[PDB]
Design a protein around this nucleic acid. Sequence first.
RNA 1: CAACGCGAAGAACCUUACCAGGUCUUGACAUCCUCUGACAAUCCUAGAGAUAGGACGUCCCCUUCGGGGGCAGAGUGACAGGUGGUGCAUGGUUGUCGUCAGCUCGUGUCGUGAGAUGUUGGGUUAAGUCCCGCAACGAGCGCAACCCUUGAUCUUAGUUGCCAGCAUUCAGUUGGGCACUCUAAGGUGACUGCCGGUGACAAACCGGAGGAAGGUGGGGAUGACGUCAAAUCAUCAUGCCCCUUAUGACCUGGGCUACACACGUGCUACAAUGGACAGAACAAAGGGCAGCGAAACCGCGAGGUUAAGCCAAUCCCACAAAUCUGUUCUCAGUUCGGAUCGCAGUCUGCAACUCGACUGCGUGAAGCUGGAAUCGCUAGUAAUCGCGGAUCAGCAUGCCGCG
Lengths: 77, 151, 95, 206, 60, 103
Amino acid sequence: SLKKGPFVDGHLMTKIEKLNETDKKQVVKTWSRRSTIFPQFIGHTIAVYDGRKHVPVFISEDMVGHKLGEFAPTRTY
Amino acid sequence: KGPVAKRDVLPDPIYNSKLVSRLINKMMIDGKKGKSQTILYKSFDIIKERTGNDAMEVFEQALKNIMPVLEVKARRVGGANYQVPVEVRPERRTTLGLRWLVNYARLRGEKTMEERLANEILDAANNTGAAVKKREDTHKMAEANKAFAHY
Amino acid sequence: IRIRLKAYDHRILDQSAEKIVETAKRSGASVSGPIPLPTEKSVYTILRAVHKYKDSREQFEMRTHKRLIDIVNPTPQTVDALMRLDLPSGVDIEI
Amino acid sequence: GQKVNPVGLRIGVIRDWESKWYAGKDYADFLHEDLKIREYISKRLSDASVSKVEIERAANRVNITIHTAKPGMVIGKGGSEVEALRKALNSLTGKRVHINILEIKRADLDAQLVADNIARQLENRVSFRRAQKQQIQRTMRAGAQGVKTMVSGRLGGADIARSEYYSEGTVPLHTLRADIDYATSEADTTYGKLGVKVWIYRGEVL
Amino acid sequence: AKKSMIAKQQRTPKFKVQEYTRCERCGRPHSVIRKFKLCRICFRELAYKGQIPGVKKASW
Amino acid sequence: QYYGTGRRKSSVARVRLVPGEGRIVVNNREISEHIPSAALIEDIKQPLTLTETAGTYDVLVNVHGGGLSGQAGAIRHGIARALLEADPEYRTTLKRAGLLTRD
RNA sequence: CAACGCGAAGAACCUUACCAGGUCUUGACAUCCUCUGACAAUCCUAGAGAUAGGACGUCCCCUUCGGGGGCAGAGUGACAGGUGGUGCAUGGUUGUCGUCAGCUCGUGUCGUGAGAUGUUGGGUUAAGUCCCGCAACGAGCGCAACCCUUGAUCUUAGUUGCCAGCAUUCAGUUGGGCACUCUAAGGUGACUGCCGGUGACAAACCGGAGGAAGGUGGGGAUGACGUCAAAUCAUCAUGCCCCUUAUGACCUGGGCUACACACGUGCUACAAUGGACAGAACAAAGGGCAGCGAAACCGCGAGGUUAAGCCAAUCCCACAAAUCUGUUCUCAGUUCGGAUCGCAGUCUGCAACUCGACUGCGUGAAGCUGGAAUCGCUAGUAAUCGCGGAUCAGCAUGCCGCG
């Protein structure tokens, strides 16, 4: 995405809006590693499905410039 | 079986010579005959400039100097690995002279292949030269292997 | 006014061209002869083997002979004649 | 690796195309439709002993030529057979389909039906020698410059499967102008699967 | 798992991008052909059997 | 209008040797305008020097395909062929060159 | 040898088989049986979705009233599935000897026998091709042959090809010609055809004129009996064995792309036949309909916007680069190489993060020719520079071909 606008899943955006309209609260589980981090993601300890488990990650300010997969490794060693 | 024929292109305005045409065919890399032609032309021009003489005679004398008369061919008769001197036909002599000229010229090492070939032609006209070192080594080997002039 | 043909059948296309030329000339239209346009062709490479042996290969040839016929005189008689002319389907007559 | 069949090599030399039409934008679609038609007609007339079936595209009309070698078994009364053969194709294809039926004279010469009969005799537990020899004699008396029949697989053994050759006359596969009729057949027996290979040399064209 | 794979190929994909090609005769991916939509061995055998009016033996 | 075709390595010389003064046109261009590295220019006239035809015929050609060297070769080959077809008197002399290679 | 740029002619999901997780069990898929009637198509929740909770909504038709032609569902079991095993059970398809020239059969003879004679001996050829002799006479599979391509010519035809003679054009663009390349058709031609010599006078070989073509003109297709219990149960079928509310099926994600490693194949480099910049010429083949996309504008850029034209000798892809003529640097780990690398962007696609390519910015190492040993190449071959297509929404140093 270059000028079409940032990228995010509709269901995840709706969940985040519902959770932010009143106050940030329990983890928001989702399988959308594709989603790009926005300023709204700040404060929400989102969870990412790495394939076998959900890894809760606290999204800070500087996370806007990365994707959830950048914080959700998959390979093991 | 048997031998095979061949031919080349003689005409060359700068110092017309069949051996010059063969040299042009040699030293060529990557199918770039124009580069070799230009290199030879500029080298002959530099030769004519530095030395007040036609480059044709200098090239002929360099070839006469580098041309090897006797070749030392290896031969394994038993566990000895002997060698046999051989009389080189003029064609093989010219080809060997061209090979040595080109190889030692590019091996010398200077700022341009033009100057390298010019200085090589000079050190060939004057018997003291790199290709003449190869000539002398080959002659020494042929002399040391004179015991087998004929089987 | 023009008409073209496209066929993979050498002799069938030749015969169709000859027949159309005759039918168009018999009425005095002065139609130019069949124009031998370049034949479009293609080739496909396939492995003779099933699983292994990449080196084993075959080549299939595809050829289509295209020709053009341009009428010189209107001659609606020739138009009706060609309209009522029936030829094989291997040429796919096209106007 | 071994020899190649003459059916794909003799095209353009003598043998004409079993499919004669010029298509566009629907080449693969028509090819698949014709493949399905051939599959269905073969599975239906498998008992009628049909050798081959050619098709011709006629601008939304399809002309099908069938070589059966026995008309009374493919047309029979004329009406019931033609209905059952044409309306089924029409319904399964979606457009008009015209059928033509030719009869193969000397039915013992076409490789397709020859291999079909050999496979039937094998499935009938007939010895692989008697059937082969009888079919070879039948073809030779019917008239053919050369006949070659090969059967490979389990001919009664379990540990080993081997081939058998039986041919009389001249079968010059390397001669381009030979009009050799080639066809294959399969026979699924209780001991496994048997494959019948038959290519018959009928004559050369000058 | 061959006819199951054929049914999966025939399934209506979520996105058109998710569509993949099959030769429509067997279940052989990995170099199915476009112009004929027929499998390698299938197309070869069919061309040898006189079908495919356009394709013949090539020589150059 | 004598005509000739100097087919060589995909480079065809559509040469028409017509009586002129000696002008050589290459795809509607001059000799120096088209071909640098005149080492080949003198070679083109090899047969033109073997037989005295200096300035009696003009050479108008439309050379399509091939590099500079291949184009010059096709040009001289077509020149030789057209000159032979025009006057075969010197064919006995030009048979020792031929210039036909099927390259 | 005949595995290792091989299946697989292009792994973000899909392809995907394998795995974590969420699931189902006449099942994803095809025949069976009883019915109730069209299914679809829009919309909210869970969703990752499988799938459900569901609402809007179902318009099926044909007949002389039974019924029939599909689709969905609701129950039953016959069944389905097997990328599960066996290529030491197989069909089918290919690799090797091998494009090597041999392998065989009918009759007759000999040997009490397995077997030989034909196929041995002499000459000769790419050939067991041919000739002579011949206790043997004939024949088949082979080999050359006729098949295709190219090298030259007569004729048939000049539009979407060509432009000379003619007149116009900034353009071959116009009137005009089919002279001519050219293309696509019928023929011819090269077939030891002719002469000398050799050889047995023959088969056969050297030279000689013509000719495009001289001794299968070059290349492609064509792979003789059989060997390797050769490869493929994975393209397909396949008997046998095994699972079946699971060794079957649906979906999200992951893996198929990890590397202290070693080895095959290929590309790039180590520089002066060189590096960077200015100017210039020639291409051959192939593709174009949700496809190919002129031209114009924007942007250093990859590329984006409007859009001509083309179902194509018309129009486009698509201005080939090597190369040449100049300017410039100078022998250095460098004005060499661009890998690894940080950032900013472009093509596509729901999304290039595990996971493409490309572009600009700033750097830039390994590397200065590489051990035993080893590989390909006898002419338009080697070496080397570009071009197009397959697989493809988007992906090629590999593949196919061309110059």
